[model samples]
Each structure stands twice: as C-alpha cells, then as structure tokens.
Target: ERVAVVGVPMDLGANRRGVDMGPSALRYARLLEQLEDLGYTVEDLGDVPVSLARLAYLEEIRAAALVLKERLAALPEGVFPIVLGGDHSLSMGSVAGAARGRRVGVVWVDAHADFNTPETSPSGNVHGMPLAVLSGLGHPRLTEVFRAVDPKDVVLVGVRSLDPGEKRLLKEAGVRVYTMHEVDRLGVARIAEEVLKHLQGLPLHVSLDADVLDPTLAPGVGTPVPGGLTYREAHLLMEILAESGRVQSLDLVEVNPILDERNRTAEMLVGLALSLLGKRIF
Candidate 1:
C-alpha cells in the first residue's frame, strides 16, 4: 500500500515552544526514505499552518484543524495516512479525518490522561485537553469544529498520570483505560490482545504520544513522565497492531527535537512507525 503523510506544524496547544518542529525533525530522521526502503510508495502532502501570529489560538486551532480533518477525510482509498504532529492537539483533527465519516475506534497511547475540559483545566493549555475535545466535551469552538468521537470507542493505554477532573471524566464517560498498573499486571502482549478485542470490528486510528515512552528513552517530549513503556513494550504493542491489520492511520505527536540527544527521539519514532507499518523480524 502507498503511504501518505501530512505535517502538522502547530504548537499553539502547549505552553512549550519546541515541538512545532516535530514534522521537520521526523523528516530529518528520514521517515520517508525508510518507508520506501520498507517497499511502500511514500507521498508527502507537505505542512499545514494553524493561524496568524497575532490571533488567539482558540479560533486558529479550530480553523487549521478543519483543514487537516478535511484533507485526511478525503485521502484516496488504500493509502495509509500518517499524521506527523507538533502536539497531541493535532489528534483533534487526525482522528476525525481517519474516521472518514464513519465509526472508528481510537487507541490513545500516552502517559497523561488528555481528558481535561475548560472548566476542569487548571492551566487551560489546549494540548492537555484534546482527548476531551475528541470525545465531544470541552470549549465550544473546539467541540463545534470537529466531529465527536464516542468515549465508548476509545481506549487509553500507557496512562500513568492524570488530573483530578480527567480521572472523573474518563470514568463517567466509560472510557476503557489501561494505566501503567495494568501494563505492569497484564503485560503488553495481553493488553494488546485485549485492546484489539475491545475495539474489534471497527477501523482503528492510533495516537501515540512520545512521552508514553520513559523519559530516559524518549526525552524530547515537552512533558516527560517516569515509568513509561519500555523499548520492547512499545514495539510489542505496535507489532501486534500490525499483525491485526486494523490500524488505518496514526499520529506521531509531541516530539520536540530541540530537547533530544541530537536526533535520538526522532530516529526512534521513525523505527516505531515502521513497526506499525509492517516492518518485522521475520
């Protein structure tokens, strides 16, 4: 299958400033060439801008995300789309676009629970609240612009941290979550099996936060949480998802190359993408 890529170069979500170069950094890591080496025709659709420098990010995020949503929604049949993101905020568009106007399940792999709403958010940073925005909650502009993802169809994995409001929100919305405790208990293999079964019979879009990996392994993320998935655990999950052949799209978000040990994080991200795209030991 041919692979299609889109660069979302907006950091209007987080309080930090480096991840806006996520797309460029990933490119520097040779994502396209590696995919081609894996024997797939790769296409780069270029970068999409969010807003003018002077405007409030609220309306700008909505505007730019709308363009992203529309573009992915219209991708040619059988062309696998990979969204390279500046922040987790990009999922507000990538996940919706991956749905292609149909029901889709999401596997959000992150260290922090992204379920905060405007009222519940202490910092009011847009990046921290995309999962809530995707689940059809949060501020009006964020909700009104994107299609809502049913909380029932979403599963959160590798979660180890959350705000008080996010904890309440995930439980009340009935979102199935596998925190680090579960990963410690069930192991990544079994959890991967369960995630497949839980979201079975639906198209899948994976949203992977680089911070989901331990800070020691992937330190370029703006927010680094300890005790995250190890190198093997993350690969096992991605390989299993590839075996299922159900994932239709992916988001490699929150990679801040400036903070990386050279391009280590970006390079790691490229390999992970290959695993999901069917690179294997066999």
Candidate 2:
C-alpha cells in the first residue's frame, strides 16, 4: 500500500512555540527514507501553512485542518495516511479526513485525556479540546468540520493526566479509557487484545502523542507527564496494532526538538512508526 505523508506545522492549539517545527524535526530524522525502506511507495505532501501570530492562531488552525481534511479524503483506496503534526489539535482534522464517510474507531495514545471542551479547558488551549470536538462536544465551528464519531468507538490509552472536568466528561460520555494503572495491572498485550476486540471490523486511527512515552525516553514534548509507557511497552503496542491490519491513519504529534536531546524523540517516534507499519523484532 502507498503511504501519504502530510505535515501540519501548526502549534496554534497550544501555548508552545517550537512545536510548530515538529514536522521538520521528524523529516530531519529521515522519517520518509526509513518508511520507504519498509517497502512502501511514499509521497510527501509538504507542510500546510501555519501562523505564529496569536491574533490569528485559531483561524489558522481551522484553515489548516480544512486543508488536511481535503487532502486525506482525496487519497486512493489503498493509500494510508501518516500525519505529522505540530500539535495534538490537528487530529480534529486528520481523523475526520481519514474517516472518509466510514465510521472509524480512534485509539488515542496519549498522556492527557484531551477530552476537554471550551467550557472545561483551564488553559484555553484548543489542542486540549480536539477529542471533545471530534466527539461532538465543542463549538459548532470545530465540530462542524466533520461528523462526530461515536464515543464508544473511541479508546484512550496510556492516560495519566486529566483535568477534573475532563474526567467527568469522559465518564459521562461513556468513553473507554485505559489509564497507566490499567496498563500496569493488565499488561500491554492484554490491553491491545481488548482494544482490537472493542474496535473489531472498524477502521482504526491511531493518534500517538510523544508525551505518552516516559519523558526520560522522550523528553521533547511540550507537556511531559511523568510515569508513562516504557520503551518495550510502546513497541509492543505498535507491533500488535500492525498485526490487527485495521489501522488506516496515524498521527505522530507533540514532538518538540528544541526540548529534545539531539532529536532523540524524533528518532524514537520514527522507530515506533516502523513497528506500527509492520516491522518485526526478528
């Protein structure tokens, strides 16, 4: 299958600045070349325009999302989308585009719940509201970009941090959340099995945020929550996902090279991508 690499160099969703350079950092780590080495035809769609001006940040993010949605929707049937993000907020568009008129399930691999709406967000960062908007809980402008996915179809994995409001919202909406505690109790393999069973026969979209990894291993994220998935656990999750054969799109977001140690985070994320795309330990 062909892979379409679309970059969204946007950081308008958060308070961070360097994240706007995440796409470049990942490219510098030879992401495309390595993916090509995996025996797939890869095409780089380049970066969607993003703005640095605070005055126009929200408008810019929405504009970029619209562009991303159209590009992803136009891809051929066998083509998979590998979306490189400037922030988690881009998922609002990436997931919508990947859905392509089919009901798809979301596996959100992140440190934060990202289930806040404009009313619940403490930081007022739009990045923190993507999941809510995608689930049809936010402003009409944001939710109107795409049809909402059923809350039951969304699974949040590796979550360790969450706002009080986010917690209430998730429970109220009946979304499935497997926190770090569950990972410790049930093992990643068991969790993966459960995830597959839950989303069976549905197209899967995996949105991976770097902060889901322990900051000791991936310290380039803008928001680093301590005590995250270990290296092996992360790889195992990817390997299992690859075996499922249901993954249709992916998002690798929140990689901030300015805070990284020589692009270590980018390299590690690339390795994870490889595992998800069918790399094997043997």
Candidate 3:
C-alpha cells in the first residue's frame, strides 16, 4: 500500500514561533525512513505553502488548507495519507482532503479539545479553533473546507483541558470525548473498543496532537497539559485502531522543537505512527 505524506508548515494559528518548523522537525526525526521500514510505499509530498504574518491568520490558513484538500483528494485511491503539520489548524485541511466527498470519522487524540470558536477563544488563536471549524461551528470560510466529518462522527481521546465557552459548544455539537479522567478510569483498551464501535463502517482520520502524551514523554508541545496518556496506553489505542483497518488518514500535529528536549517529542510521535501503521510486538 502507498502512504502519502504531506506537510502543512502553517504556524499562524498558534502563539508560538517554531511550530511552523514542525514538518522539518518531524522529518529530522526520521519519519520517512521509519515509514519505509514498516513496508509501505512512501510518497513524500513537500510542505504546503503558508506563512505567519498576521494575528489569528484564519485567511492564510484557509488558503493553504484549500490547496492541501484539493491535492490530498486528488491522490490515487488506496493510498494512506499521513499529514505532518505546523499546528492543529492543519486538520481543517487534512480532514477535508481525506473526506472530500464522503463521510469519514475523525478520532482526535489530544490534551485539549481545540474546539473554541472565534467568539469563545481568549487568545484568538486559530489552532485552538480547528475542531470547532471542522465540526461546522466556525466562520463559513473555515467551515466551507469540508463538512463531511459530522460532529457526531468525531471522537476526542485523552482530552484534559477545555476552554469554558467551547466546553458548551462541545456539548451542543454532540462530539464524544473520552478525557484523561476516562482514560484513568476505563483504560485505553475499553476506550478503544468504544471508539471502534462508534466509528464503525466509516473510514477514520486519526488526528494525533503530540500533547496527548504525558508532558514528560513529549515536552515539545505548543500547549502542555498535565496527566496525559502513558506510553503503553497510547500504543494500545493505536494498535487497536490499526487492527480495525478503517483508519484511512492521519495527522501528526503540534510538535514544537523549540520547546522540546532534543527532538524527544517528535521521536515518540514517530513511534506512535509506526504502531498505527501496523508495526507490532511478537
């Protein structure tokens, strides 16, 4: 099977500087080589053109996402798409691209919901609002990216933080979320069961924000929240999802090298990707 890799070097959605270097940082972590090791034909499509000149640059991010959506949707069928990102805003494009004209479920693995809208967000960061946009809740331009991913089909795992206003929106949107509290109580195995059952029959786009791991495990995050998924727990979730054979696309987003300890965060993310791609233990 072919694995299509595309990078969206977009950082205007976040409050950090080096987040735009996410694509470069992931590549330096041997992402491509490792994918090849898993026996998939790797297709490295270079970074999408983007910039960070303005505050809350939704327009620029939308433009880049629109271009990425067209390219991803046009790729030959049967190619598994894995998107490397500059920020969570990249999901607006990646998910849209993968679900161009069809229904697809999104499994968002992250520490925060990233569901705030322009009116509810305190920092005016578009990165924090991507889930909202993808759920058909943000500006029409952002929502226009693609509405194939209905909020009902969206599942958020490992969430430990949420903005006050967006918390209400999350309820209103009816997105299922299994926060760290649930991870601690029910465990990843049971959670994975529910996730697969809920998203059954639809191809999945797993949007993994690196911060979903414990802060100690992945220190290079644009936003760090305490008490996240442990290494084995994260792996088990990926393994279970991979076994379902419904995961069609993936997003590795929000790995910031400037705040990391020698690329350790990216390294962990790479390992998680490998697990999702069918790397197994004997």
TM per model? 0.96, 0.97, 0.97
Question: How much lDDT does candidate 1 score?
Answer: 0.87
Per-residue lDDT of 100-196 in model 3, one digit per residue for the tens? 6788999999999989887899888878888888888877878876455789999999999988998899999889999988988999999999999
Residue-level lDDT of model 1, residues 177-244, one tens digit each, is: 99999999999999999999999998889998889999898888867898899988999999999989
Better of 1 and 2 by TM-score: 2
Error of 1 at 256 (Å): 0.5
Q: Tell how far residue 39 is off in model 2, in angstroms.
A: 0.6
Write out the backbone clash pairs for model 1. none
| lDDT (0 to 1) per candidate | 0.87, 0.87, 0.87
Tens digits of per-residue lDDT, candidate 2, 179-248, equal 9999999999999989999999999999999999999989888688999998889999999988999999
* C-alpha RMSD between model 2 and the true structure: 1.4
